């Protein structure tokens, strides 16, 4: 055991002396209280600790205990509904023991060892096991949970207990290699679960946003930024993005999320529908969210908890959703930690090692086939935050060194209460032509076609918007004003996806493709209509303008009744008029 005491304390950091035999990154209980830090910088024999919990009431000379075994996170049954937070504890339970307030120095085990679940063997003695393969199933809620052999563990089998509930630390499969392979297993946070062969995504990702997906998609396995200047749309679009998901598991890491936001988040989930058990969305979510009240390093740690959980579910063969909320977290963490540990800052308070862990976290994500031989995919949607209000900031330029898909949320669109706010002049995607196979195979043949047919509209709208503000378009000719008011409906009823109306909160390919053919009609008719001398003025009064506007006055699951219906009147009752 590593038995120092304290030496200096420097804010929420602590430095320690007497520290001999200490490895870089371990479990570090500081003082007798045991606040849980981490050994980061090692100079001499004086090992810099960085405490995830407050250091009010922490004197010097108090015995510092370190395990000399790496910080690992607990992974095993009871993961869903469960909490692992940013500091390795379950809040559900903390709530009851410590009363209304949480009192620092309190710790418990991350994974509740009080839990029991049934064991279904898939192995027998005299088997040959390899890392990541399945030993047994476990039925936990509407999900199937498997018992992943820890990676890098091989050898033969001595016994396998018969079915029945057991405590989730007792051995269910004893190996004949002299290892009683316990039901749960640790796997260090830094370390990432292997892969047999690395692949690339090709299954789409729907999230319940109409325009968002249809113009600039993200694959199932993909990654994108959401930079949102001045405390606008960004902050609760992420809630509306995690509200509905295509992916099987939902892993939501708020990464030291502000307590006034977590309020509505946490309570919403029991009331949200789950589409595999018909109840609480909590039967398919895990909260890795942590409190903002805690210091800076509890918001760095939290991201590294999340991913090693994500991977655990991806290795069982499930589509995994990971949503990091606010890069304003991450920035602040490293911003302040840099001063503490006497690191030399390179530019603007950010440490030289800024895109270091940042890059790699993004890297891990992808649809890939594991060393267990199952296929899951980690899909990422981080919400980017510029502290300064421009992307010139080092913390935001780094989040733009990665590729794939992008999105841009602007302060100005957001005011009008049209969320999602997306700019056709501000994003690009590389999952357009990577997803084109699985489009013209499942979705429809005329879906790689129809998507192009909306883009052109709003292409010309950028170019002409300019001209509009310099001299009105009433002075301009007919055909100039044409596409301008095609454009109206592309915002009025198709950039407003009400998070308070539930027939816009649902969206899918049928509602996609659908309203795309509505718009299509109108475009090709109006272009010919006005070459017969008609003016766009009269047409605003014609019933045809209203008619395309039905997208938020029509259902999701009574939609194929109203689709075809109105569709016809577009090519019918406007060339009569």
């Amino acid at each position: 055991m590593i038995q120092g005491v304290i030496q200096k304390i420097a804010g929420p950091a602590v430095i320690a002396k007497g520290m001999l035999g200490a490895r870089m990154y371990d479990i570090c209980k500081v003082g007798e209280e045991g606040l849980v830090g981490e050994i980061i910088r090692l100079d001499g024999d004086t090992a810099f600790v960085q405490v995830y919990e407050d250091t009010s009431g922490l004197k010097v000379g108090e015995p510092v205990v370190s395990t000399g075994l790496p910080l690992a996170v607990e992974l095993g049954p009871g993961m869903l509904n469960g909490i692992y937070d940013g500091i390795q504890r379950p809040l559900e339970r903390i709530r009851e023991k410590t009363g209304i307030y949480i009192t620092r120095g309190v710790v418990v085990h991350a994974l509740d060892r009080e839990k029991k679940w049934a064991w279904t063997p898939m192995v027998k003695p005299g088997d040959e096991v390899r890392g990541g393969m399945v030993l047994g199933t476990v039925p936990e809620f509407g999900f199937t949970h498997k018992i992943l052999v820890p990676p890098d563990v091989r050898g033969r089998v001595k016994e396998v207990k018969p079915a029945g509930e057991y405590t989730v630390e007792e051995p269910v499969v004893v190996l004949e290699d002299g290892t009683e392979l316990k039901m749960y297993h640790t796997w260090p946070v830094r370390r990432a679960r292997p892969v047999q062969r690395k692949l690339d995504p090709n299954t789409p990702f729907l999230t319940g946003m109409r325009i968002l997906d249809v113009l600039f998609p993200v694959a199932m396995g993909g990654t994108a930024a959401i930079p949102g200047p001045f405390g606008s749309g960004k902050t609760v679009t992420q809630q509306s993005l995690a509200k509905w998901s295509n992916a099987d598991v939902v892993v939501y890491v708020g990464c030291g999320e502000r307590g006034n936001e977590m309020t509505d988040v946490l309570v919403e989930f029991p009331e949200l529908t789950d589409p595999k058990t018909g109840g609480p969305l909590m039967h398919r979510t895990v909260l890795i969210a942590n409190t903002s009240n805690m210091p800076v390093a509890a918001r760095e740690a939290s991201i590294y908890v999340g991913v090693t959980i994500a991977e655990y579910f991806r290795d069982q063969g499930f589509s995994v959703a990971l949503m990091a909320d606010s890069t304003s977290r991450w920035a602040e963490a490293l911003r302040e930690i840099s001063s503490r540990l006497e690191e030399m800052p390179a530019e603007e308070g950010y440490p030289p090692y800024l895109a270091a862990r940042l890059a790699a976290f993004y890297e891990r994500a992808g649809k890939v086939i594991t060393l267990g031989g199952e296929e899951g995919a980690v899909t990422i949607v981080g919400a980017v935050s510029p502290p300064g209000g421009d992307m010139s900031e080092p913390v935001t330029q780094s989040t733009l060194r990665i590729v794939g898909a992008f999105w841009r949320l602007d302060a100005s669109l957001a005011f009008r209460r049209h969320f999602p706010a997306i700019n056709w002049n501000g994003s690009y995607s590389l999952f357009t032509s990577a997803l084109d196979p699985w489009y013209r195979e499942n979705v429809a043949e005329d879906y790689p076609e129809l998507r192009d047919a909306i883009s052109e509209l709003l292409q010309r709208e950028a170019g002409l918007q300019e001209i509009v503000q310099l001299v009105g378009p009433d002075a301009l000719q007919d055909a100039e004003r044409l596409v301008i008011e095609v454009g109206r409906i592309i915002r009025e009823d198709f950039l407003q996806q009400n998070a308070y109306h539930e027939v816009d909160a649902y969206c899918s390919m049928k509602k996609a493709y659908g309203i795309m053919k509505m718009i299509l009609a109108f475009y090709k008719e109006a272009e010919a209509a006005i070459k017969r001398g008609v003016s766009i003025d009269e047409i605003l009064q014609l019933p045809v303008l209203e008619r395309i506007g039905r997208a938020r006055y029509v259902s999701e699951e009574e939609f194929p009744a109203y689709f075809e219906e109105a569709m016809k009147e577009i090519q019918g009752a406007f060339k009569a008029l």
Binding site: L20, G21, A22, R23, M24, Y25, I40, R41, L42, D43, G44, D45, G68, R190, K198, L199, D200, P201, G221, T223, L341, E343, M344, P345, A346, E347, E348, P352, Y353, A355, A356, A359, A360, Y362, E363, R364, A365, G366, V368, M391, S392, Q397, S398, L400, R401, I402, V403, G404, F406, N425, G426, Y428, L430, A434, Q459, A462, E466, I467, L470, V471
Partner: protein, 457 residues
């Protein structure tokens, strides 16, 4: 196995009982994670030394530490036959089979090439993008960075140059098809899509049995982002010069380079001096770029193509800074032609060129695009610029004369600069070019001669 730490944090370690170590020396070490990593003795001291590990420390106790001088200089085994094989920044082949036996073990630090040993090249290549092969003329032993913004593609455009890179058979007056043409790659930080995207266009290229790949990922250490560049180029030196083949080297993600450069920048002793980046940066971008050049007495060459990815569209940013100066003749991409759907989205209006009547446009390089280059410039300008001037002067105000200016803008750009999967030979370029030039009557077409006009009528 020397024990006694003093500072550990990141890939910079300090450990005592040393003075037997030299500048640029391979050591090994022990860690508490039960693994043996690397170390380059980048700096040396009185009774310690600065070590640079080839992997990130994630565990290193002070009970167990080690140092063992493997070799005095620092090197990599390099042999003639290693084409068809893939590699990584560590330098192990990632193929799955035993590592090949060297012929020379050459240093990874790099030996510079004499400015006396080179001489002006003049044999041009087809890049399959018209715009280059007219305006800048990409010849062997020449650099030409392709400047790329952040939020802009970098991957897309790069691929076009790799599958449509090909010498002229005698369109320049000769070929070099008589000697094997081959390509070298080395990526310095790549994600999940950029990994596979490159590999599947190399099967388009049909080259995976005659190429040397030094892929560095972002899951791979961050320290090998600046090791790998030098390293790769020494396997260029070996195969172009000493085994006479025209090797194309293509370097990408020189922003992920710069991430790793920054690290050593401030975490080491040295202080920043290039507006918040190091001052030994210069040397770091010199040793890299200056190796390349056609040598006079050798048939073969190292043609380097840098592909940047620099933060935003700033020009005060460290990267485009030094890179500009270094290279002779440059190419830019922007967002003017990337909103139109024109791949590649090359824009030469702000771009510059310094070799196009300097051993190129004359010589064994055709003179039939000589006056064309000079003409296209001021002609393309007349275009772009007045698109701006119109929105101030009026809203549609353009005079008899200026009307013509703007008429030649939209046209040239659409046809010409959309290439992509379309290859145009030296002849095919000039024909088409002159027919858009007939939109301007004689008097703006002063620069093209009497011959030229009729030549390509």
């Amino acid at each position: 196995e020397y024990t006694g730490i003093t500072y550990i944090s990141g890939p910079l370690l300090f450990v005592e009982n040393a003075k037997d170590l030299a500048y640029g020396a391979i050591v090994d070490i022990k860690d508490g994670t039960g693994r043996v990593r690397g170390g380059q003795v980048i700096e040396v001291s009185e009774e310690y030394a600065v070590i640079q590990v080839f992997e990130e420390t994630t565990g290193l106790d002070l009970a167990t530490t080690s140092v063992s001088l493997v070799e005095d200089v620092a090197r990599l085994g390099v042999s003639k036959e290693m084409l068809g094989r893939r590699f990584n920044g560590i330098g192990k082949p990632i193929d799955g089979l035993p590592p090949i036996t060297p012929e020379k073990r050459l240093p990874i630090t790099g030996l510079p090439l004499n400015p006396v040993a080179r001489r002006k090249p003049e044999q041009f290549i087809q890049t399959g993008i018209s715009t280059i092969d007219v305006m800048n003329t990409l010849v062997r032993g020449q650099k030409l960075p392709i400047f790329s913004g952040s939020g802009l593609p970098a991957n897309e455009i790069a691929a076009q140059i790799a599958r449509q890179a090909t010498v002229r058979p005698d369109l320049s007056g000769e070929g070099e098809k008589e000697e094997p043409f081959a390509v070298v790659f080395a990526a310095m930080g790549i994600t999940q899509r950029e990994l596979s995207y490159f590999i599947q266009e190399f099967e388009r290229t049909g080259a995976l049995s005659r190429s040397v790949l030094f892929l560095n990922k972002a899951d791979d250490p961050t320290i090998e982002r600046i090791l790998t560049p030098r390293m790769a180029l020494t396997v260029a030196e070996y195969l172009a010069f000493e085994h006479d083949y025209h090797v194309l080297v293509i370097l990408t993600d020189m922003t992920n380079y710069c991430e790793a450069l920054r690290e050593i920048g401030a975490a080491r002793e040295e202080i920043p001096g290039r507006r918040g980046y190091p001052g030994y940066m210069y040397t770091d971008l010199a040793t890299i770029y200056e190796r390349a050049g056609v040598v006079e007495g050798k048939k073969g060459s190292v043609t380097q193509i840098p592909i940047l990815s620099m933060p935003d569209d700033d020009r005060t940013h460290p990267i485009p800074d030094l890179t500009g100066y270094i290279t002779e003749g440059q190419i830019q991409l922007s967002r003017e032609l990337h909103r139109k759907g024109i791949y590649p989205p090359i824009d030469p209006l702000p771009s510059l060129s310094r070799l196009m009547n300097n051993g190129v446009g004359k010589g064994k390089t055709r003179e039939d695009h000589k006056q064309v280059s000079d003409q296209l410039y001021s002609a393309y300008a007349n275009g772009v610029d007045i698109r701006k001037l119109v929105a101030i002067i009026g809203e549609d105000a353009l005079t008899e004369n200026d009307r013509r200016y703007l008429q030649f803008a939209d046209a040239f750009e659409r046809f010409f600069i959309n290439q992509g999967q379309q290859n145009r030979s030296i002849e095919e370029s000039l024909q088409i070019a002159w027919a858009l030039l007939s939109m301007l009557p004689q008097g703006e077409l002063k620069r093209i001669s009497k011959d030229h006009i009729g030549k390509y009528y």
